[PDB]
Symmetry: C2
Subunit: 101 residues, 2 copies
């Protein structure tokens, strides 16, 4: 029993939100109807240095349903300073710049 990587585009349902203890909560929606599937998500230093950095608090999250616009709540621990949240893959990829103080 396995599921594939999600192939369709995600969207940020709300702003990434500072939790107050160095982590960030993000409510995503998945515009695919093809789930359950594994979410391609990482934190990167820049859009050219795509080595994953930081830590996913909600590691390896899945879209759990085939419902349209399925909601997934992810939490991450970016490094201090500037980083990008990158969700989705390829032409479907979206990104969001985060500054952690």
């Amino acid at each position: 029993t396995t599921y594939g990587m999600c192939t369709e585009k995600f969207s940020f349902a709300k702003n990434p939100a500072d939790t107050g203890h160095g982590t960030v909560v993000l409510e995503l929606q998945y515009t695919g109807s093809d789930g359950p599937c594994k979410i391609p998500i990482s934190i990167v230093a820049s859009l050219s240095d795509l080595t994953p950095i930081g830590r996913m608090v909600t590691a390896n999250p899945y879209v759990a349903s085939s419902e349209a616009n399925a909601k997934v709540l992810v939490e991450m621990e970016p490094p201090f300073g500037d980083s990008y949240i990158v969700v989705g893959r390829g032409d479907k990829q979206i990104n969001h710049h985060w500054h952690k103080a």
Copy 2:
């Protein structure tokens, strides 16, 4: 921006499923209507030795919606041998015995 721990009972929507590479996929449903909330989930050696062991592949998962019977897909890496998946808390807790070979 924070969410609480889920307080209501979960159910196993399907059997825990061997992925073929030492991990287990579980499709849960949350009977609460009070989400988003953080799922109390761990792997334990016995129902008396409740020290969390193993590894959560999908670490720190959330119920992402207030919909009834929200689906969440979790993956875990139990230790070899016998362990229990325990989901939910207190009187709401459910458990499932797993044997990893």
